[PDB]
Design a protein around this ligand. Structure first.
Ligand SMILES: CC(=O)N[C@@H]1[C@@H](O)[C@H](O)[C@@H](CO)O[C@H]1O
Ligand SMILES: [Ca+2]
Length: 375
């Protein structure tokens, strides 16, 4: 509709047609108007880094590590039961909990119905918003939480787990048996829900998400690519070693792994395994998944990175990523659609350009590359 009131009246019809009761709808929308803060967040396609090392610094903050250790102790019984029942490592569940809501202290302060209605009414992704809004109304109808306490982020990610509504409906768990899947106020429900989602996403209990490695001299950096997987044994037969030298972890010889270079060839290198892919299902960002894995490791005194981070790591802004794609295309290295998103097609073009300049082909774009392109 044109007015918010008009849009809501029309959506109310769709909500009823989808099985939401009038009382649930009217209770959910009581007092609701568009939220400009949500509109701003939706619109803000940013202009600034990063870099991964500052992001990891915040994520691996000793304050967050110690708070997770405290939570592991406080909730040891529940976590033991969740770890055993879902076959998902407690440290990973708690690391996700820390990264998503700071173990429940930062769930956001926005009402999920207001936020999703705002996005449905005037957001850039109304298909997503409408779908999530109807799912959210189903959650209210089922009674998992009262409308007043259905809290989450601007994009509709909810509660301690930051599940979007359709993910809650599919994977949230009632751990304590009161009949509510309360990912807002019940640590047990939240933790079991997170575990259930990780397990559905392929988690193998006890298997590392990945680990730091040392690459051999004259390494083929075009292989550092998440879309390329190889057995650990094959990586070993390529000259990839443990971070201090010597063979890679034993027994895993047949495990498929990809090479992750979060700061290009001058930075630390990681082999990442299937459990890393599981974390990406939670949040499809390699920086996020690396932070979750290192945080999980940190609870037990791990998470130490041996390779130095490059001092000159200054990630490209939105503007620069678009400029990079245009300059690559102009030089004859086709990155595909100029969308300002560095994915596989752009990395392919970056690698060809790096090879043209005689640089290691790590597919990792830097201000130096952009300068050289402008010559
Ligand atoms: C924790 C969580 O809900 N993560 C979701 C994932 O469930 C959903 O499939 C994805 C689609 O791209 O959007 C993310 O927000
Ligand atoms: Ca419950």
């Amino acid at each position: 509709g044109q007015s918010f009131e008009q849009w809501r009246d029309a959506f109310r019809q769709q909500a009823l047609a989808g099985g939401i009761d009038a009382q649930t709808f009217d209770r959910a929308f009581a007092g609701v108007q568009p939220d400009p803060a949500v509109v701003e967040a939706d619109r803000s396609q940013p202009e600034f880094t990063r870099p991964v090392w500052k992001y990891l610094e915040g994520a691996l903050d000793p304050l967050r590590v110690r708070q997770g250790q405290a939570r592991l102790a406080q909730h040891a019984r529940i976590l033991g039961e969740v770890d055993a029942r879902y076959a998902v490592d407690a440290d990973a569940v708690v690391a996700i909990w820390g990264m998503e809501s700071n173990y429940g202290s930062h769930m956001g302060n926005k009402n999920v119905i207001r936020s999703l209605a705002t996005l449905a009414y005037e957001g850039r992704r109304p298909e997503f918003a409408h779908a999530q809004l109807l799912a959210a109304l189903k959650i209210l109808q089922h009674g998992d939480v009262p409308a007043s306490f259905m809290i989450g982020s601007w994009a509709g990610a909810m509660g301690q787990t930051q599940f979007i509504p359709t993910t809650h409906n599919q994977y949230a768990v009632d751990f304590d048996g009161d009949g509510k899947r309360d990912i807002w106020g019940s640590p047990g429900d939240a933790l079991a829900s997170t575990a259930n989602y990780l397990k559905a996403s392929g988690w193998i209990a006890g298997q590392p998400w990945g680990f730091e490695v040392r690459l051999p001299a004259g390494f083929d950096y075009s292989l550092a690519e998440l879309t390329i997987r190889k057995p650990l044994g094959e990586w070993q037969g390529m000259g990839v070693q443990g971070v201090n030298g010597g063979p890679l972890p034993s027994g895993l010889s047949g495990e498929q792994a990809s090479l992750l270079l979060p700061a290009g060839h001058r930075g630390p290198a990681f082999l990442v395994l299937h459990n890393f892919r599981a974390i990406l299902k939670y949040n499809n960002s390699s920086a996020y998944a690396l932070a979750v894995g290192l945080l999980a490791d940190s609870f037990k005194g791990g998470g130490r990175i041996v390779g130095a981070w490059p001092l000159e790591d200054v990630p490209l802004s939105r503007s620069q990523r678009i400029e990079l794609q245009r300059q690559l295309a102009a030089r004859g290295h086709d990155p595909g659609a100029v969308d300002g998103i560095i994915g596989a097609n752009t990395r392919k073009a970056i690698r060809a350009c790096q090879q043209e300049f005689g640089w290691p082909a790590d597919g990792y774009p830097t201000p130096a590359l952009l300068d050289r392109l402008r010559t």
